[PDB]
Design a protein around this ligand. Structure first.
Ligand SMILES: Nc1ncnc2c1ncn2[C@@H]1O[C@H](COP(=O)(O)OP(=O)(O)OP(O)(O)=S)[C@@H](O)[C@H]1O
Ligand SMILES: [Mg+2]
Ligand SMILES: [Mg+2]
Ligand code: NI
Lengths: 337, 378
């Protein structure tokens, strides 16, 4: 156990063992002295305040341990200052640093299709791999997507990820990148949600502005449906008041994304269209999209991984039990060479 | 998850409320069950106004349920200002039937799981003598009872361009209060649905029961209302309960009674919506008689003293608690009637009545005269 030390930043104390030093910002940069290169340290915000926070925390550890793809972040080291199954009340995750975020990058930089063309192919590569492990991500935004100086990229943040099922948590994803299925049919979605946000991110990493910045969950359904048109009643029949609300709004025609985004890569239109529809069944998957026209510059078929175990994390457990299965998972870690 | 919560609030109304209370013997101290009342006061675009006050019992699930769902059934386009009166009656009937159908549908699965469990217990054996093998099944039956129970009474008002409509299911009340130079004229726009209501008596008779023994017993299954939203025990299990046993159709229905087209042009005053608990508690303190008249006049007073409609409504609710509390506490005649009161909700909608503080010589009976006494006894 490396002797720990304490430093204050943004009004909180960070108790970390040495190795890492010269902290500078929920996550800071540092230099691991055992290594010789800069690293990113993530302190979990509140690790066990509710039963759902402990089970959100337990999953973000157990999933990142699982994935090994050059496009999805995995863990180099995980540690805690606490001693035993008692002092335990903090965890830290530390990943090789990137020096940039997609959100900041687009807040001060025009961007080419050839930039884009590559970034997304990387995304769908990790996505196709994540879906081929039975895990949904649920939160895909520029804020939680990382890129290198070259423009290499990996997927961040598994605080919101889960082994898929028919019954799922209802309030989910950031608002502007929240699939209509999220609200128009409570708790009964799949992994097509992840792909809807990718299209949302696709045309943001172009134009530079948020595709659907609706204020409330109502304003959001209005914005989305004024570009894909209203549901012609084939998809409709959702639930009760959900119906009711849509009938209250006037007819908006669907539009082809040609007239939509001017001066586009018509290569991208066609992929934007095949991505951001409404019918969950009839729309692209990361695989069928990977092998697609747009990425012929880089497509080289992109392998799948094992499946994620469940057993424990599909039952009803207490805020204690959820935190112990977390600790039994921090105690057993093994680094990579 | 609510498709109706963006809706702007009404600027011409306010609400006062207080929860149930039971008075302690130890001296001071009270106890409460979770409050089962609710309300709404929206203004759509359309320029449609919708008000409601809701009295729940057997938990507050049904009360919340009718509150979300009836909004979604009424303010999402189905009402508009150019709607004839036939239009308004149809829409309100449609709205109320949707809410009652989907509530019953919402619990059919739970009711089916309940029966399958109940058959898995030894027939007739008091559950307390039952060994630990069954303890899991009992636990579940306690939990299912919690998600299927509950009922609600509702009083609802619709205002479209000076036309006032009222829809009622139960014993909550609606008072239109106009100002004349004589004074305040109070009239109840709806009728109470009890077994004292002559027309409910005819409706209950026409379902094959005994208007005579129904009037005599007066109550049914805890509540006085002869109409309620929800409550599976009376919408499904009425054939078991006796002197209610041999009915051809549901004795307690969820259908609203609609009272409609009150012209409000050139009217000055206010609209009252209040829950049963409010006026019952005053009738416990003062005797039955004139609770509508007395609560109206309380409201009259606070109009001149308070700064907003919410303070007006809440001051009247506060005065009625104290009157009830004092009455119990004083030990006299009527204290036996006030060991507790129920949830109190009061809603006040203004129609041009003024709010806010900024808004002689006596001749002798028989004259003197400079110049054997008796008095008449009665
Ligand atoms: N490995 C990394 N390399 C570079 N920047 C990173 C790295 N990890 C995190 N960041 C930065 O930290 C920001 C937020 O990281 P997240 O992983 O989303 O943490 P978080 O969202 O605060 O945690 P939660 O509670 O699970 S949502 C990103 O927008 C990046 O700017
Ligand atoms: Mg699986
Ligand atoms: Mg994040
Ligand atoms: Ni009540």
């Amino acid at each position: 156990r490396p002797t720990f030390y304490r430093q204050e930043l943004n009004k909180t104390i960070w108790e970390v063992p040495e190795r890492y030093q010269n902290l500078s910002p929920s996550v800071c940069a540092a230099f691991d002295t055992k290594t010789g290169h800069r690293v990113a340290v993530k302190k979990l915000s509140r690790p066990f305040q509710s039963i759902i926070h402990a089970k959100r925390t337990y999953r973000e550890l157990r999933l990142l341990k699982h994935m090994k793809h050059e496009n999805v972040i995995g863990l180099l080291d995980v540690f805690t200052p606490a001693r035993s199954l008692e002092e335990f009340n903090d965890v830290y995750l530390v990943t090789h640093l990137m020096g940039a975020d997609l959100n900041n990058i687009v807040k001060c930089q025009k961007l080419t299709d050839d930039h884009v063309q590559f970034l997304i192919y990387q995304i769908l590569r990790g996505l196709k791999y994540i879906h081929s492990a039975d895990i949904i991500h649920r939160d895909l935004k520029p804020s939680n997507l990382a890129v290198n100086e070259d423009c290499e990229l990996k997927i961040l943040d598994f605080g919101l990820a889960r082994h898929t099922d028919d019954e799922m948590t209802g309030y989910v994803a950031t608002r502007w990148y929240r699939a209509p299925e999220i609200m128009l049919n409570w708790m009964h979605y799949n992994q097509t949600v992840d792909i809807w946000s990718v299209g949302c991110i696709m045309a943001e990493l172009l134009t530079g502005r948020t595709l659907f910045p609706g204020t409330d969950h109502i304003d959001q359904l209005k914005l989305i449906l004024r570009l894909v048109g209203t549901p012609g009643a084939e998809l409709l029949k959702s639930s009760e008041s959900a119906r009711n609300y849509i009938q209250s709004l006037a007819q908006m025609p669907k539009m082809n994304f040609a007239n939509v985004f001017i001066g586009a890569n018509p290569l991208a239109v066609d992929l934007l269209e095949k991505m951001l529809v409404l019918d969950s069944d009839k729309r692209i998957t990361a695989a069928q999209a990977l092998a697609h026209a747009y990425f012929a510059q880089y497509h080289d078929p992109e392998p799948v991984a094992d499946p994620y175990d469940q057993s424990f994390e599909s039952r009803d457990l207490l805020i204690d039990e959820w935190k112990s299965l977390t600790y039994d998972e921090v105690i057993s870690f093994v680094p990579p060479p | 998850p609510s498709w109706t919560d963006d809706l702007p609030l009404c600027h011409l109304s306010g609400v006062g409320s207080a929860s149930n209370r039971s008075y302690s013997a130890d001296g001071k101290g009270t106890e409460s069950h979770p409050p089962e009342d609710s309300w709404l006061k929206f203004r759509s675009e359309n320029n449609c106004f919708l008000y409601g006050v809701f009295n729940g019992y057997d938990g507050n699930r049904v009360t919340n349920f009718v509150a979300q769902r009836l909004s979604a059934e009424l303010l999402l386009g189905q009402l508009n200002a150019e709607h004839a009166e036939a239009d308004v009656r149809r829409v309100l009937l449609q709205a109320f039937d949707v809410v009652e159908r989907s509530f019953l549908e919402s619990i059919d699965d739970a009711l089916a799981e309940k029966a399958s469990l109940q058959s898995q217990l030894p027939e007739g054996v008091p559950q307390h003598q039952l060994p630990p093998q069954y303890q899991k099944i009992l636990e579940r039956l306690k939990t299912l009872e919690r998600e299927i129970s509950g009922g609600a009474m509702a009083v609802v008002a619709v205002l479209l361009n000076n036309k006032l409509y009222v829809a009622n299911v139960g014993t909550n009340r609606a008072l239109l209060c106009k100002s004349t130079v004589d004074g305040l004229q109070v009239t109840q726009l709806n009728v109470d649905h009890t077994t004292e209501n002559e027309d409910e008596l005819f409706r209950l008779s026409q379902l094959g029961l005994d208007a005579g023994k129904i009037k005599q017993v007066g109550i049914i299954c805890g509540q006085e209302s002869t109409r309620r939203i929800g409550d599976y025990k009376v919408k499904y299990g009425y054939t078991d309960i006796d002197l209610l046993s041999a009915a051809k159709s549901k004795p307690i229905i969820a259908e609203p009674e609609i009272h409609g087209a009150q012209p409000l042009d050139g009217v000055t005053g206010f609209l009252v919506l209040m829950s049963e608990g409010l006026y019952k508690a005053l009738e416990a303190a003062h005797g039955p008689g004139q609770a509508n008249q007395e609560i109206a006049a309380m409201i009259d007073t606070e109009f001149a003293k308070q700064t907003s409609l919410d303070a007006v409504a809440q001051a009247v609710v506060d005065r009625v608690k104290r009157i009830h509390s004092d009455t119990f506490a004083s030990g006299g005649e009527r204290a036996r009637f006030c060991p507790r009161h129920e949830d109190m909700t009061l809603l006040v909608r203004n129609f041009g009545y003024p709010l806010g503080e900024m808004s002689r010589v006596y001749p002798v009976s028989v004259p003197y005269s400079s110049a054997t006494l008796s008095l008449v006894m009665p």
